[PDB]
């Protein structure tokens, strides 16, 4: 019910309201960016990171405190992704859908490195600086105490999502399916079992079990093997910026606070859009682009997040979009009835746009979905 501008003013205000005087110096070189930053920030007291940041890129002498800070935040937000640290991995091909590495304990300091990354992200928000690390909306949901949903599974694992939907909409007592409330996990060669609930090894999934099994399994699909690393990140953040300060944001708004808003190239978008059952000459498609033309930039980004799962664009624009199974341009499909809302498949960067009866119908249903659904 509250707008993003209002929420941004109310958060910034609360940061401005908890500031400290003076400054902190952080000295790094381009070649030891990560290690210098890690030590200096972690041997500092967390609240002191709310003071004015003086980042020294030792050797570079082009300066501007807010410009070197800007550059630092960017470079380091990438350097934490270095595979040598074994902290992160991708659920899909071509660096699609970042997630914490369950095997990260092969790095004996991983929990301390994650608490450092937590601090670094809170420093970015607190100082209004931007990062390009590429966290997913479910990761942001966790920062806002939002539980991942059935829809979210399709982003990380469309086949898992479809198997859960099938269970959700079939009769278990009619097909012979035998499942139990327990999951196998193999991390670094060690295979472990996790009970979804007490005694779940012996509890079989029935029609009367189903809904509970699905929501316990959904949570487990996002939390498995990364509980301790995730806790270390959240603590590191909370040390610097109380997580309580994010109470009003949703996950898509939080991603904008950390990534920054940039102006969306309308031509790049339309040239790189592909169509299923529709064409570029379809009634509803030409209506679609009128609704997008009438949107302000804030709402276009929101449309991008609804369909693709992020506001971030690759190098080379919309032609280079990535899905769960590889390259995957923005796509619009004729799916659904006139009584449905538009729904997205973020793994395929797809908008199921029903064959609406009027421009006014499409405009209201599109704007409603991009604002209230995911």
């Amino acid at each position: 019910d509250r707008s993003f501008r209002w929420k941004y003013h109310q958060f910034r205000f609360l940061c401005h309201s908890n500031a400290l005087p003076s400054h902190v110096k952080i000295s790094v070189s381009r070649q030891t960016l990560f290690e210098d930053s890690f030590q200096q920030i972690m041997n500092m007291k967390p609240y002191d990171l709310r003071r004015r940041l003086y980042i020294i890129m030792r050797g570079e002498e082009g300066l501007d405190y807010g410009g070197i800070a800007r550059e630092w935040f960017f470079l380091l937000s990438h350097e934490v992704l270095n595979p040598m640290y074994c902290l992160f991995e991708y659920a899909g091909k071509n660096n699609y859908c970042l997630q914490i590495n369950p095997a990260s304990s092969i790095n004996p300091d991983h929990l301390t490195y994650f608490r450092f990354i937590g601090r670094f992200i809170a420093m970015a928000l607190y100082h209004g600086k931007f990062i390009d690390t590429g966290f997913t909306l479910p990761f942001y949901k966790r920062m806002l105490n939002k539980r991942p949903t059935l829809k979210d599974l399709e982003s990380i694992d469309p086949e898992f999502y479809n198997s859960i939907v099938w269970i959700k909409e079939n009769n278990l007592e009619e097909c012979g399916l035998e499942l139990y409330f327990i999951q196998d996990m193999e991390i670094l060669g060690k295979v472990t079992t996790h009970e979804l609930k007490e005694g779940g090894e012996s509890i079989r999934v029935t029609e009367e079990n189903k809904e509970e099994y699905i929501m316990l399994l959904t949570d487990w699909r996002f939390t498995r093997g990364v509980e301790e690393q995730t806790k270390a990140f959240l603590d590191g953040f909370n040390e610097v910026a109380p997580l309580e300060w994010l109470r009003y944001f949703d996950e898509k708004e939080l991603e904008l606070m950390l990534c920054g808003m940039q102006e969306i190239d309308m031509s790049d978008w339309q040239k790189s859009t592909i169509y299923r059952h529709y064409t570029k000459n379809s009634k509803q498609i030409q209506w679609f682009w009128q609704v997008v033309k009438e949107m302000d930039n804030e709402k276009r980004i929101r449309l991008l997040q609804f369909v693709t799962g992020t506001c971030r664009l690759p190098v080379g624009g919309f032609a280079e979009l990535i899905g769960s199974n590889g390259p995957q341009k923005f796509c619009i499909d004729k799916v659904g009835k006139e009584t449905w809302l538009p729904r997205s498949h973020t793994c395929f960067n797809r908008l199921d746009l029903p064959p609406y009866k009027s421009y006014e119908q499409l405009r209201e249903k599109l704007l409603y979905a991009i604002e209230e659904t995911e």
Partner: peptide, 13 residues
């Protein structure tokens, strides 16, 4: 048939 897809679901989950 429809136990082709239960086997597939069962392997995935």
């Amino acid at each position: 048939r429809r136990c082709i897809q239960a086997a597939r679901v069962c392997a995935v989950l």
